Amino acid sequence: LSQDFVEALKAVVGSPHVSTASAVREQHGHDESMHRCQPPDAVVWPQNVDQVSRVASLCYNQGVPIIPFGTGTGVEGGVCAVQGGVCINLTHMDQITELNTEDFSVVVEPGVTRKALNTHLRDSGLWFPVDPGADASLCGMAATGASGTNAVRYGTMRDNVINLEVVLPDGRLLHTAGRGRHYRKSAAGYNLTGLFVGSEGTLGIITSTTLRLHPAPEATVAATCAFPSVQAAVDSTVQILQAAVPVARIEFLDDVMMDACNRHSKLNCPVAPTLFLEFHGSQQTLAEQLQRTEAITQDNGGSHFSWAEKRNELWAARHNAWYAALALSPGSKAYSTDVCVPISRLPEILVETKEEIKASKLTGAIVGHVGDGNFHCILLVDPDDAEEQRRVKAFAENLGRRALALGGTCTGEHGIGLGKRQLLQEEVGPVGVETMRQLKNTLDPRGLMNPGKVL
Ligand SMILES: Cc1cc2nc3c(=O)[nH]c(=O)nc-3n(C[C@H](O)[C@H](O)[C@H](O)COP(=O)(O)OP(=O)(O)OC[C@H]3O[C@@H](n4cnc5c(N)ncnc54)[C@H](O)[C@@H]3O)c2cc1C
Ligand SMILES: [Mn+2]
Numbered sequence: 001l002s003q004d005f006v007e008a009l010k011a012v013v014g015s016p017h018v019s020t021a022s023a024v025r026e027q028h029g030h031d032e033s034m035h036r037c038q039p040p041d042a043v044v045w046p047q048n049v050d051q052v053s054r055v056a057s058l059c060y061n062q063g064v065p066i067i068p069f070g071t072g073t074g075v076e077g078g079v080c081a082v083q084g085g086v087c088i089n090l091t092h093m094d095q096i097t098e099l100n101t102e103d104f105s106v107v108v109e110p111g112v113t114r115k116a117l118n119t120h121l122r123d124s125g126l127w128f129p130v131d132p133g134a135d136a137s138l139c140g141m142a143a144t145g146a147s148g149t150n151a152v153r154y155g156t157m158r159d160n161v162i163n164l165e166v167v168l169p170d171g172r173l174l175h176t177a178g179r180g181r182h183y184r185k186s187a188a189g190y191n192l193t194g195l196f197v198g199s200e201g202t203l204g205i206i207t208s209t210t211l212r213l214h215p216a217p218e219a220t221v222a223a224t225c226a227f228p229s230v231q232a233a234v235d236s237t238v239q240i241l242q243a244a245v246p247v248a249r250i251e252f253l254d255d256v257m258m259d260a261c262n263r264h265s266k267l268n269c270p271v272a273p274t275l276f277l278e279f280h281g282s283q284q285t286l287a288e289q290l291q292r293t294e295a296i297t298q299d300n301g302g303s304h305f306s307w308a309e310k311r312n313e314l315w316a317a318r319h320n321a322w323y324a325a326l327a328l329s330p331g332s333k334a335y336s337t338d339v340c341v342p343i344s345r346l347p348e349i350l351v352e353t354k355e356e357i358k359a360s361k362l363t364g365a366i367v368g369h370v371g372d373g374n375f376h377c378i379l380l381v382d383p384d385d386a387e388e389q390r391r392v393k394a395f396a397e398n399l400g401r402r403a404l405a406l407g408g409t410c411t412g413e414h415g416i417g418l419g420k421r422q423l424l425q426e427e428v429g430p431v432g433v434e435t436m437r438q439l440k441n442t443l444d445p446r447g448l449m450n451p452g453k454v455l
Contacts (some may be wrong), residue, residue, distance in 0.1 A: 001041040001084075005062060009044055009086070012054045017045040017092070028069055028079065028087045032134070032322070034333035034381050034389070035077030035418050040067055040087035047092055049165070049173065049207045056205060057171030059086050065448045066169065068201035070110055070140025073132070075322075075336050076417025078144070078200050082452035091137065093207065096120055098180075104213045105162060105182045110139035110206065117211075126213040129154035132413075133319035139206040145198025147413040149249045149318065152371030153280070154214055156413065158197050163210035166196055166203075169444040174204065182210050195439065200415050201450040203443045217248070217280035221290065222314055223305035225297050226272040230254060230354045230366075232300040233273040234347045237370045239296045241343055245289055249278035251318055252375060254354060254366035257325070264324035265317035269306070276318055277305070318367075325365040325378040332363075332380040335419070337396050339403030340374040340412030349402055353377055356399075362392060374412035397423065416454045424454070 001020065010018045019025070020042045029039030041064075046052040059066045065085025072079055081087060094111025101124055108117060113135045117128050131148035132141060140146075142164060147156040154160070163177040175181070176192040196203055227233040233252055240247060252275060253261065259271045275297070279289045294305060317324070326334050341349055350366070357364040357377065368375035377399060379392045400410040400423040410416075410423035425433050437455055441447075 001064070005058075005064070006042065008058055009042065009055065012058065013044055013046050013051050017047065019043045025087070028072065028089065029081055031072045031074040031077060031079050033075045033077050033417070033419070034335050034383070035080050037077070037080035037082055038084060040081040041084045043069075043087045043089055045089045045092050049093070049167065052088070052090070052093075052167045052205055052207050053171040053173060055086070055088060056167050056169060060170045060446060060448055063446065063448065065451050066205070067450050068143065068205045070137030070143070071113065071135065073134035073136045074140070074144060074415070074417065076415050076419045078415065078417040078450070078453055080418060082418070085448070088205065090139065090205070090207070097208075098182075098210075100182065101126055101213070103182060104215075105210060106213055107163075107208050107210050108138045109208050110137050112138050114138060114141070121213070125216050127216050128160075128211055129214050130157055130160055131319070133322060138211065139209050142197055142209045143199060143201055143206055144415045145413060147369060147372065147374075149251050149315070149369060151369060151413075152250055153246060153248045155212075158194060160212040161193060161197050161209055162212055164193055164196050164206055165208035167205040167207055169204060169446070169449045177210075198415065200417065200454055202440060202454050203449060218282045219286055220248075220278065220280055220311070221286055221307070222249075222276070222278040222311040223307050224269055224314070225275045225277060225305055226270045226303040227274065227297075228272070228301045230273045231347060231351050232302070233275055234350050234370060236275065236297045236300040236302060238343055238346060239299070240293055241371060243292060243296060245293050247277060247289070247293065247371060248280040249276065249315075250371040251276040252350075252366070252368060252370040253318075253321070257321060257365040257367045257378075260324040260328050260365055261317045261321055264327050265313070265320060267313070267317050270303070275302070276314060278311070278315075321365070321367045322378065325367075325380065328365070329363060329380050329382075332382050335379050335381060335392055335396060336414065337377040337379070337399050338374065338411040338414045339400060339408055340372060341403050341406045341408030343373040345406040345408070346370060346373050346375075349399075349406060350375060352402065353399060356395070360391070360395065362388070362395060364395075369412065372412060373408070401426070418453060421454065
Protein backbone atom coordinates (compact mmCIF):
# COMPACT_ATOMS: atom_id res chain seq x y z
CA LEU A 1 0.00 0.00 0.00
CA SER A 2 1.70 3.20 -1.25
CA GLN A 3 2.56 6.23 0.86
CA ASP A 4 0.65 8.53 -1.50
CA PHE A 5 -2.46 6.40 -0.95
CA VAL A 6 -2.07 6.48 2.84
CA GLU A 7 -1.70 10.26 2.79
CA ALA A 8 -4.86 10.49 0.67
CA LEU A 9 -6.72 8.41 3.27
CA LYS A 10 -5.42 10.70 6.03
CA ALA A 11 -6.57 13.74 4.07
CA VAL A 12 -10.16 12.42 4.26
CA VAL A 13 -10.49 11.19 7.85
CA GLY A 14 -7.59 12.83 9.68
CA SER A 15 -4.21 11.42 10.63
CA PRO A 16 -5.39 9.90 13.98
CA HIS A 17 -8.02 7.87 12.11
CA VAL A 18 -5.70 5.97 9.72
CA SER A 19 -3.36 3.22 10.90
CA THR A 20 -0.86 1.00 9.09
CA ALA A 21 0.63 -0.36 12.34
CA SER A 22 0.93 -4.16 12.38
CA ALA A 23 -0.72 -4.63 15.77
CA VAL A 24 -3.68 -2.44 14.84
CA ARG A 25 -4.15 -4.27 11.55
CA GLU A 26 -3.92 -7.68 13.24
CA GLN A 27 -6.60 -6.61 15.74
CA HIS A 28 -8.88 -5.97 12.75
CA GLY A 29 -7.84 -9.05 10.75
CA HIS A 30 -10.13 -11.56 12.42
CA ASP A 31 -13.50 -11.94 14.06
CA GLU A 32 -14.58 -14.48 16.66
CA SER A 33 -14.35 -17.36 14.12
CA MET A 34 -11.53 -19.87 13.72
CA HIS A 35 -10.69 -18.32 10.31
CA ARG A 36 -7.18 -16.85 10.10
CA CYS A 37 -5.99 -14.57 7.16
CA GLN A 38 -3.27 -11.97 6.62
CA PRO A 39 -4.37 -8.64 8.23
CA PRO A 40 -5.73 -5.66 6.26
CA ASP A 41 -3.12 -3.26 4.89
CA ALA A 42 -4.63 -0.35 6.82
CA VAL A 43 -7.47 0.44 9.21
CA VAL A 44 -9.49 3.64 8.71
CA TRP A 45 -12.13 5.20 11.01
CA PRO A 46 -14.39 7.55 9.04
CA GLN A 47 -16.12 10.15 11.21
CA ASN A 48 -19.23 10.83 9.09
CA VAL A 49 -20.94 9.53 5.96
CA ASP A 50 -19.20 12.01 3.63
CA GLN A 51 -15.90 10.53 4.82
CA VAL A 52 -17.17 6.98 4.28
CA SER A 53 -18.10 7.90 0.71
CA ARG A 54 -14.73 9.54 0.05
CA VAL A 55 -12.78 6.62 1.53
CA ALA A 56 -14.79 4.14 -0.56
CA SER A 57 -14.27 6.18 -3.74
CA LEU A 58 -10.53 6.48 -3.07
CA CYS A 59 -10.15 2.72 -2.55
CA TYR A 60 -12.46 1.70 -5.36
CA ASN A 61 -10.81 3.83 -8.04
CA GLN A 62 -7.33 2.74 -6.91
CA GLY A 63 -8.15 -0.96 -7.01
CA VAL A 64 -7.83 -1.41 -3.23
CA PRO A 65 -10.23 -3.84 -1.48
CA ILE A 66 -12.63 -2.49 1.13
CA ILE A 67 -13.55 -4.51 4.23
CA PRO A 68 -16.37 -3.03 6.33
CA PHE A 69 -15.81 -3.65 10.03
CA GLY A 70 -18.38 -3.21 12.79
CA THR A 71 -17.71 -4.83 16.14
CA GLY A 72 -15.83 -7.85 14.77
CA THR A 73 -18.12 -10.42 16.45
CA GLY A 74 -18.98 -12.34 13.28
CA VAL A 75 -18.30 -16.06 13.16
CA GLU A 76 -17.66 -16.72 9.45
CA GLY A 77 -14.54 -14.68 8.73
CA GLY A 78 -16.39 -11.77 7.19
CA VAL A 79 -13.75 -9.22 8.19
CA CYS A 80 -10.77 -11.42 7.26
CA ALA A 81 -8.71 -9.55 4.67
CA VAL A 82 -8.12 -12.45 2.28
CA GLN A 83 -6.92 -9.98 -0.40
CA GLY A 84 -5.53 -7.27 1.88
CA GLY A 85 -6.88 -3.76 1.47
CA VAL A 86 -8.45 -1.15 3.72
CA CYS A 87 -10.49 -2.20 6.76
CA ILE A 88 -13.11 0.51 7.42
CA ASN A 89 -14.00 0.51 11.11
CA LEU A 90 -17.37 2.24 11.25
CA THR A 91 -17.89 2.52 14.99
CA HIS A 92 -17.01 6.18 15.55
CA MET A 93 -20.32 6.96 13.82
CA ASP A 94 -22.23 6.07 16.98
CA GLN A 95 -25.33 8.29 17.11
CA ILE A 96 -29.00 7.37 17.50
CA THR A 97 -31.31 9.66 15.51
CA GLU A 98 -34.88 10.07 14.32
CA LEU A 99 -36.28 8.28 17.35
CA ASN A 100 -39.98 8.11 16.44
CA THR A 101 -41.60 6.34 19.37
CA GLU A 102 -45.13 7.09 18.07
CA ASP A 103 -44.22 5.28 14.81
CA PHE A 104 -42.19 2.51 16.50
CA SER A 105 -38.97 3.37 14.65
CA VAL A 106 -35.43 4.68 15.14
CA VAL A 107 -32.31 5.30 13.03
CA VAL A 108 -28.90 4.09 14.26
CA GLU A 109 -25.31 4.55 13.05
CA PRO A 110 -22.85 1.62 13.02
CA GLY A 111 -21.31 2.35 16.45
CA VAL A 112 -24.68 1.78 18.17
CA THR A 113 -25.00 -1.66 19.75
CA ARG A 114 -28.29 -3.26 20.80
CA LYS A 115 -27.25 -2.65 24.44
CA ALA A 116 -26.73 1.04 23.72
CA LEU A 117 -30.05 1.33 21.90
CA ASN A 118 -32.11 -0.40 24.58
CA THR A 119 -30.40 1.66 27.30
CA HIS A 120 -31.42 4.75 25.34
CA LEU A 121 -34.99 3.38 25.19
CA ARG A 122 -35.75 2.53 28.83
CA ASP A 123 -38.71 4.57 30.18
CA SER A 124 -39.98 4.74 26.57
CA GLY A 125 -41.95 1.51 26.81
CA LEU A 126 -40.23 0.34 23.62
CA TRP A 127 -37.34 -2.00 22.92
CA PHE A 128 -35.42 -3.55 20.06
CA PRO A 129 -35.72 -7.36 20.23
CA VAL A 130 -33.21 -9.00 17.88
CA ASP A 131 -30.61 -10.33 20.31
CA PRO A 132 -27.38 -11.98 19.18
CA GLY A 133 -25.42 -13.07 22.23
CA ALA A 134 -22.61 -10.63 21.44
CA ASP A 135 -22.69 -6.85 21.94
CA ALA A 136 -22.78 -6.32 18.21
CA SER A 137 -23.16 -3.29 15.97
CA LEU A 138 -26.79 -3.02 14.83
CA CYS A 139 -25.62 -2.10 11.33
CA GLY A 140 -23.37 -5.17 11.39
CA MET A 141 -26.42 -7.17 12.40
CA ALA A 142 -28.26 -5.78 9.36
CA ALA A 143 -25.24 -6.69 7.20
CA THR A 144 -25.21 -10.30 8.39
CA GLY A 145 -28.98 -10.85 8.47
CA ALA A 146 -28.75 -11.65 12.17
CA SER A 147 -31.38 -13.18 14.41
CA GLY A 148 -31.43 -14.34 18.02
CA THR A 149 -33.46 -15.90 20.82
CA ASN A 150 -36.31 -13.37 20.47
CA ALA A 151 -36.73 -13.91 16.71
CA VAL A 152 -39.29 -16.74 17.03
CA ARG A 153 -41.77 -14.09 18.24
CA TYR A 154 -40.39 -10.69 17.20
CA GLY A 155 -38.64 -11.49 13.90
CA THR A 156 -35.14 -11.41 12.47
CA MET A 157 -33.18 -8.41 11.20
CA ARG A 158 -34.89 -8.94 7.83
CA ASP A 159 -38.24 -8.52 9.57
CA ASN A 160 -37.16 -5.48 11.57
CA VAL A 161 -35.05 -3.42 9.12
CA ILE A 162 -37.27 -0.79 7.47
CA ASN A 163 -34.61 1.25 5.65
CA LEU A 164 -30.83 1.31 5.13
CA GLU A 165 -28.37 4.07 4.32
CA VAL A 166 -25.66 2.50 2.17
CA VAL A 167 -22.45 3.89 0.72
CA LEU A 168 -22.09 1.93 -2.52
CA PRO A 169 -18.63 0.68 -3.56
CA ASP A 170 -17.82 3.68 -5.74
CA GLY A 171 -18.96 6.17 -3.05
CA ARG A 172 -22.56 6.92 -4.09
CA LEU A 173 -25.08 7.26 -1.25
CA LEU A 174 -28.21 5.08 -1.42
CA HIS A 175 -31.18 5.20 0.92
CA THR A 176 -32.66 1.84 0.06
CA ALA A 177 -36.28 2.83 0.76
CA GLY A 178 -35.77 6.57 0.25
CA ARG A 179 -34.16 9.22 2.45
CA GLY A 180 -35.95 9.57 5.77
CA ARG A 181 -38.70 7.10 4.92
CA HIS A 182 -40.24 4.73 7.43
CA TYR A 183 -43.51 2.84 7.07
CA ARG A 184 -45.14 -0.52 7.72
CA LYS A 185 -45.33 -1.82 4.13
CA SER A 186 -44.64 -0.79 0.56
CA ALA A 187 -45.01 -2.08 -2.99
CA ALA A 188 -43.12 0.87 -4.48
CA GLY A 189 -40.63 -0.44 -7.03
CA TYR A 190 -38.23 -3.25 -6.18
CA ASN A 191 -37.50 -3.75 -2.51
CA LEU A 192 -33.87 -2.69 -2.21
CA THR A 193 -33.73 -2.91 1.59
CA GLY A 194 -34.01 -6.70 1.58
CA LEU A 195 -31.13 -7.02 -0.89
CA PHE A 196 -28.69 -5.29 1.45
CA VAL A 197 -29.80 -7.11 4.61
CA GLY A 198 -27.54 -10.16 4.74
CA SER A 199 -25.09 -8.83 2.15
CA GLU A 200 -22.15 -9.07 4.62
CA GLY A 201 -20.34 -6.01 3.31
CA THR A 202 -20.07 -7.34 -0.25
CA LEU A 203 -22.56 -4.90 -1.81
CA GLY A 204 -21.82 -1.66 0.04
CA ILE A 205 -21.27 -0.08 3.46
CA ILE A 206 -24.27 0.32 5.77
CA THR A 207 -23.90 3.70 7.45
CA SER A 208 -27.31 3.78 9.11
CA THR A 209 -30.17 1.37 9.75
CA THR A 210 -33.83 2.27 10.32
CA LEU A 211 -35.18 -0.25 12.83
CA ARG A 212 -38.64 -1.38 13.88
CA LEU A 213 -39.17 -0.99 17.62
CA HIS A 214 -41.60 -3.08 19.66
CA PRO A 215 -43.71 -2.46 22.76
CA ALA A 216 -42.26 -3.85 25.95
CA PRO A 217 -44.24 -6.89 27.13
CA GLU A 218 -46.87 -6.32 29.81
CA ALA A 219 -45.47 -9.19 31.87
CA THR A 220 -42.66 -11.72 31.44
CA VAL A 221 -42.11 -15.25 32.77
CA ALA A 222 -39.02 -17.35 32.08
CA ALA A 223 -38.39 -20.98 32.89
CA THR A 224 -36.17 -23.94 32.17
CA CYS A 225 -37.41 -27.46 31.46
CA ALA A 226 -35.25 -30.59 31.59
CA PHE A 227 -35.93 -33.57 29.33
CA PRO A 228 -34.91 -37.24 29.27
CA SER A 229 -33.57 -37.00 25.72
CA VAL A 230 -32.84 -34.70 22.80
CA GLN A 231 -35.75 -36.32 20.95
CA ALA A 232 -38.13 -35.39 23.77
CA ALA A 233 -37.00 -31.76 23.91
CA VAL A 234 -37.19 -31.22 20.16
CA ASP A 235 -40.54 -33.02 19.78
CA SER A 236 -41.86 -30.71 22.51
CA THR A 237 -40.56 -27.74 20.52
CA VAL A 238 -42.18 -28.88 17.27
CA GLN A 239 -45.47 -29.53 19.05
CA ILE A 240 -45.40 -26.13 20.82
CA LEU A 241 -44.98 -24.45 17.42
CA GLN A 242 -47.66 -26.57 15.76
CA ALA A 243 -50.04 -25.68 18.62
CA ALA A 244 -49.36 -22.00 17.74
CA VAL A 245 -48.33 -21.03 21.28
CA PRO A 246 -46.81 -17.52 20.81
CA VAL A 247 -43.73 -18.24 22.94
CA ALA A 248 -41.30 -15.34 23.19
CA ARG A 249 -38.17 -17.50 23.48
CA ILE A 250 -37.61 -21.23 23.05
CA GLU A 251 -33.92 -22.18 23.18
CA PHE A 252 -32.45 -25.68 23.16
CA LEU A 253 -29.29 -26.76 24.98
CA ASP A 254 -28.09 -30.33 24.90
CA ASP A 255 -26.59 -31.85 28.03
CA VAL A 256 -23.06 -30.86 26.95
CA MET A 257 -24.15 -27.24 26.39
CA MET A 258 -26.04 -27.20 29.69
CA ASP A 259 -23.02 -28.43 31.62
CA ALA A 260 -20.75 -25.91 29.88
CA CYS A 261 -23.14 -23.04 30.69
CA ASN A 262 -23.37 -24.27 34.29
CA ARG A 263 -19.58 -24.20 34.59
CA HIS A 264 -19.20 -20.83 32.86
CA SER A 265 -22.06 -18.87 34.44
CA LYS A 266 -22.61 -20.55 37.83
CA LEU A 267 -26.05 -21.72 36.80
CA ASN A 268 -27.05 -24.98 38.46
CA CYS A 269 -29.56 -26.48 36.05
CA PRO A 270 -29.85 -30.27 35.88
CA VAL A 271 -27.40 -31.56 33.26
CA ALA A 272 -29.88 -32.72 30.62
CA PRO A 273 -31.25 -31.62 27.25
CA THR A 274 -33.05 -28.46 28.27
CA LEU A 275 -35.39 -25.83 26.93
CA PHE A 276 -35.01 -22.24 28.10
CA LEU A 277 -38.44 -20.68 27.70
CA GLU A 278 -39.86 -17.18 27.97
CA PHE A 279 -43.46 -16.02 27.72
CA HIS A 280 -44.85 -12.51 27.15
CA GLY A 281 -48.35 -11.25 27.78
CA SER A 282 -50.86 -10.21 30.38
CA GLN A 283 -51.44 -12.39 33.43
CA GLN A 284 -54.45 -13.96 31.71
CA THR A 285 -52.60 -14.72 28.47
CA LEU A 286 -49.48 -15.85 30.35
CA ALA A 287 -51.43 -18.40 32.40
CA GLU A 288 -53.06 -19.71 29.22
CA GLN A 289 -49.75 -20.02 27.37
CA LEU A 290 -48.07 -21.68 30.35
CA GLN A 291 -50.61 -24.43 30.86
CA ARG A 292 -50.81 -25.32 27.16
CA THR A 293 -47.00 -25.34 26.95
CA GLU A 294 -46.59 -27.32 30.18
CA ALA A 295 -49.13 -29.85 28.88
CA ILE A 296 -47.00 -30.44 25.78
CA THR A 297 -43.67 -30.64 27.59
CA GLN A 298 -45.20 -33.05 30.13
CA ASP A 299 -46.36 -35.27 27.22
CA ASN A 300 -42.68 -35.62 26.30
CA GLY A 301 -41.31 -36.16 29.80
CA GLY A 302 -40.37 -32.57 30.56
CA SER A 303 -39.77 -31.56 34.15
CA HIS A 304 -42.03 -29.17 35.99
CA PHE A 305 -40.90 -25.71 34.92
CA SER A 306 -38.01 -24.29 36.96
CA TRP A 307 -39.17 -20.68 37.10
CA ALA A 308 -36.04 -9.59 37.45
CA GLU A 309 -32.59 -10.71 38.43
CA LYS A 310 -32.67 -14.46 37.81
CA ARG A 311 -33.96 -14.32 34.22
CA ASN A 312 -31.23 -11.80 33.44
CA GLU A 313 -28.71 -14.40 34.64
CA LEU A 314 -30.53 -17.10 32.66
CA TRP A 315 -30.37 -15.28 29.32
CA ALA A 316 -26.88 -13.89 29.96
CA ALA A 317 -25.69 -17.49 30.35
CA ARG A 318 -27.49 -18.38 27.10
CA HIS A 319 -26.02 -15.36 25.31
CA ASN A 320 -22.55 -16.46 26.45
CA ALA A 321 -22.96 -20.09 25.35
CA TRP A 322 -20.32 -19.50 22.67
CA TYR A 323 -17.77 -18.64 25.36
CA ALA A 324 -19.03 -21.39 27.67
CA ALA A 325 -18.31 -23.89 24.89
CA LEU A 326 -14.82 -22.45 24.28
CA ALA A 327 -14.12 -22.73 28.03
CA LEU A 328 -14.48 -26.52 27.76
CA SER A 329 -11.02 -26.61 26.13
CA PRO A 330 -8.95 -23.49 26.90
CA GLY A 331 -6.78 -22.38 24.01
CA SER A 332 -9.13 -23.75 21.37
CA LYS A 333 -11.13 -21.81 18.80
CA ALA A 334 -14.62 -22.68 17.64
CA TYR A 335 -16.67 -23.14 14.48
CA SER A 336 -20.47 -23.04 14.59
CA THR A 337 -22.92 -24.66 12.24
CA ASP A 338 -26.19 -22.87 11.65
CA VAL A 339 -28.58 -24.99 9.59
CA CYS A 340 -32.29 -24.18 9.49
CA VAL A 341 -34.73 -26.86 8.31
CA PRO A 342 -38.52 -27.24 7.95
CA ILE A 343 -39.63 -27.60 11.54
CA SER A 344 -41.05 -31.10 11.14
CA ARG A 345 -37.54 -32.30 10.15
CA LEU A 346 -35.83 -30.68 13.15
CA PRO A 347 -36.13 -33.78 15.40
CA GLU A 348 -34.43 -36.00 12.81
CA ILE A 349 -31.46 -33.73 12.17
CA LEU A 350 -30.87 -32.69 15.80
CA VAL A 351 -31.00 -36.28 17.03
CA GLU A 352 -28.74 -37.33 14.15
CA THR A 353 -26.33 -34.49 14.98
CA LYS A 354 -26.23 -35.61 18.61
CA GLU A 355 -25.50 -39.20 17.55
CA GLU A 356 -22.81 -38.05 15.13
CA ILE A 357 -21.11 -35.86 17.75
CA LYS A 358 -21.04 -38.84 20.13
CA ALA A 359 -19.62 -41.21 17.50
CA SER A 360 -16.78 -38.77 16.71
CA LYS A 361 -13.65 -37.61 18.53
CA LEU A 362 -14.79 -33.99 18.32
CA THR A 363 -16.00 -31.85 21.20
CA GLY A 364 -19.30 -30.27 20.25
CA ALA A 365 -22.00 -28.47 22.17
CA ILE A 366 -25.52 -28.04 20.76
CA VAL A 367 -27.55 -24.87 21.31
CA GLY A 368 -29.98 -22.64 19.55
CA HIS A 369 -33.11 -21.15 18.11
CA VAL A 370 -35.20 -24.27 17.63
CA GLY A 371 -38.39 -22.19 17.48
CA ASP A 372 -37.11 -21.20 14.01
CA GLY A 373 -36.11 -24.74 13.07
CA ASN A 374 -32.51 -23.57 13.59
CA PHE A 375 -29.65 -24.76 15.79
CA HIS A 376 -25.90 -24.43 16.27
CA CYS A 377 -23.32 -27.20 16.66
CA ILE A 378 -20.40 -25.40 18.29
CA LEU A 379 -17.31 -27.46 17.40
CA LEU A 380 -14.02 -26.85 19.19
CA VAL A 381 -10.73 -26.80 17.26
CA ASP A 382 -7.15 -26.78 18.49
CA PRO A 383 -5.54 -23.94 16.48
CA ASP A 384 -2.41 -26.07 15.93
CA ASP A 385 -4.06 -29.48 15.27
CA ALA A 386 -4.50 -29.57 11.49
CA GLU A 387 -6.10 -33.02 11.61
CA GLU A 388 -8.84 -31.86 13.99
CA GLN A 389 -9.56 -28.70 12.01
CA ARG A 390 -9.92 -30.85 8.88
CA ARG A 391 -12.34 -33.13 10.70
CA VAL A 392 -14.44 -30.24 12.08
CA LYS A 393 -14.82 -28.68 8.67
CA ALA A 394 -15.82 -32.08 7.24
CA PHE A 395 -18.35 -32.49 10.08
CA ALA A 396 -19.78 -29.01 9.40
CA GLU A 397 -20.16 -29.65 5.68
CA ASN A 398 -21.80 -33.05 6.19
CA LEU A 399 -24.29 -31.42 8.57
CA GLY A 400 -24.91 -28.60 6.10
CA ARG A 401 -25.52 -31.05 3.28
CA ARG A 402 -27.92 -33.08 5.44
CA ALA A 403 -29.91 -29.89 6.07
CA LEU A 404 -29.96 -29.14 2.34
CA ALA A 405 -31.22 -32.69 1.71
CA LEU A 406 -34.13 -31.91 4.07
CA GLY A 407 -35.15 -28.79 2.12
CA GLY A 408 -33.46 -26.36 4.51
CA THR A 409 -30.71 -23.76 4.41
CA CYS A 410 -27.06 -23.93 5.42
CA THR A 411 -27.30 -20.77 7.55
CA GLY A 412 -30.25 -19.36 9.46
CA GLU A 413 -28.51 -16.19 10.70
CA HIS A 414 -24.67 -16.21 10.83
CA GLY A 415 -24.08 -15.86 7.10
CA ILE A 416 -21.70 -17.40 4.58
CA GLY A 417 -18.44 -15.44 4.93
CA LEU A 418 -15.53 -17.73 4.14
CA GLY A 419 -16.99 -20.95 5.54
CA LYS A 420 -20.15 -21.81 3.62
CA ARG A 421 -19.46 -20.67 0.03
CA GLN A 422 -19.60 -24.19 -1.39
CA LEU A 423 -22.77 -25.02 0.55
CA LEU A 424 -24.39 -21.86 -0.85
CA GLN A 425 -23.64 -22.98 -4.41
CA GLU A 426 -25.36 -26.30 -3.67
CA GLU A 427 -28.27 -24.58 -1.90
CA VAL A 428 -29.35 -22.25 -4.73
CA GLY A 429 -27.90 -23.95 -7.81
CA PRO A 430 -26.35 -22.52 -10.96
CA VAL A 431 -29.08 -20.00 -11.81
CA GLY A 432 -29.27 -18.83 -8.20
CA VAL A 433 -25.50 -18.38 -8.09
CA GLU A 434 -25.32 -16.51 -11.40
CA THR A 435 -28.20 -14.24 -10.37
CA MET A 436 -26.56 -13.39 -7.06
CA ARG A 437 -23.29 -12.76 -8.89
CA GLN A 438 -24.95 -10.49 -11.43
CA LEU A 439 -26.32 -8.45 -8.52
CA LYS A 440 -22.83 -8.31 -6.96
CA ASN A 441 -21.32 -7.25 -10.28
CA THR A 442 -23.71 -4.39 -10.94
CA LEU A 443 -23.15 -2.90 -7.48
CA ASP A 444 -19.40 -3.76 -7.26
CA PRO A 445 -18.08 -4.01 -10.84
CA ARG A 446 -14.43 -4.15 -9.79
CA GLY A 447 -15.03 -6.82 -7.12
CA LEU A 448 -13.39 -4.72 -4.38
CA MET A 449 -16.30 -4.80 -1.89
CA ASN A 450 -15.08 -7.36 0.68
CA PRO A 451 -13.68 -9.84 -1.87
CA GLY A 452 -13.66 -13.57 -1.29
CA LYS A 453 -16.84 -13.62 0.82
CA VAL A 454 -20.26 -15.19 0.14
CA LEU A 455 -19.75 -15.82 -3.59
C1 LIG B 1 -20.95 -14.88 21.65
C2 LIG B 1 -21.56 -14.60 20.30
C3 LIG B 1 -22.92 -14.83 20.11
C4 LIG B 1 -23.52 -14.59 18.87
N1 LIG B 1 -24.87 -14.81 18.74
C5 LIG B 1 -25.43 -14.58 17.56
C6 LIG B 1 -26.84 -14.84 17.41
O1 LIG B 1 -27.59 -15.29 18.27
N2 LIG B 1 -27.34 -14.53 16.14
C7 LIG B 1 -26.59 -14.07 15.08
O2 LIG B 1 -27.19 -13.85 14.00
N3 LIG B 1 -25.26 -13.85 15.23
C8 LIG B 1 -24.71 -14.09 16.41
N4 LIG B 1 -23.36 -13.85 16.58
C9 LIG B 1 -22.57 -13.42 15.40
C10 LIG B 1 -22.38 -11.92 15.28
O3 LIG B 1 -22.55 -11.29 16.54
C11 LIG B 1 -23.42 -11.36 14.31
O4 LIG B 1 -23.20 -12.01 13.06
C12 LIG B 1 -23.33 -9.84 14.15
O5 LIG B 1 -24.42 -9.42 13.32
C13 LIG B 1 -22.02 -9.37 13.57
O6 LIG B 1 -21.93 -7.94 13.69
P1 LIG B 1 -20.53 -7.23 13.76
O7 LIG B 1 -20.61 -5.72 13.54
O8 LIG B 1 -19.80 -7.64 15.06
O9 LIG B 1 -19.82 -7.94 12.52
P2 LIG B 1 -18.35 -7.94 11.93
O10 LIG B 1 -17.66 -9.20 12.31
O11 LIG B 1 -17.72 -6.62 12.19
O12 LIG B 1 -18.72 -8.05 10.39
C14 LIG B 1 -19.52 -9.15 9.92
C15 LIG B 1 -19.69 -9.07 8.42
O13 LIG B 1 -20.57 -7.97 8.11
C16 LIG B 1 -19.85 -6.96 7.40
N5 LIG B 1 -20.22 -5.68 7.98
C17 LIG B 1 -20.12 -5.27 9.28
N6 LIG B 1 -20.60 -4.08 9.50
C18 LIG B 1 -21.03 -3.65 8.26
C19 LIG B 1 -21.63 -2.46 7.81
N7 LIG B 1 -21.92 -1.43 8.60
N8 LIG B 1 -21.92 -2.37 6.49
C20 LIG B 1 -21.65 -3.40 5.69
N9 LIG B 1 -21.09 -4.58 6.00
C21 LIG B 1 -20.81 -4.63 7.31
C22 LIG B 1 -18.37 -7.30 7.50
O14 LIG B 1 -17.69 -6.82 6.34
C23 LIG B 1 -18.41 -8.82 7.62
O15 LIG B 1 -18.47 -9.46 6.35
C24 LIG B 1 -22.73 -14.11 17.82
C25 LIG B 1 -21.37 -13.89 18.01
C26 LIG B 1 -20.77 -14.14 19.24
C27 LIG B 1 -19.29 -13.89 19.42
MN1 LIG C 1 -27.54 -17.84 17.39
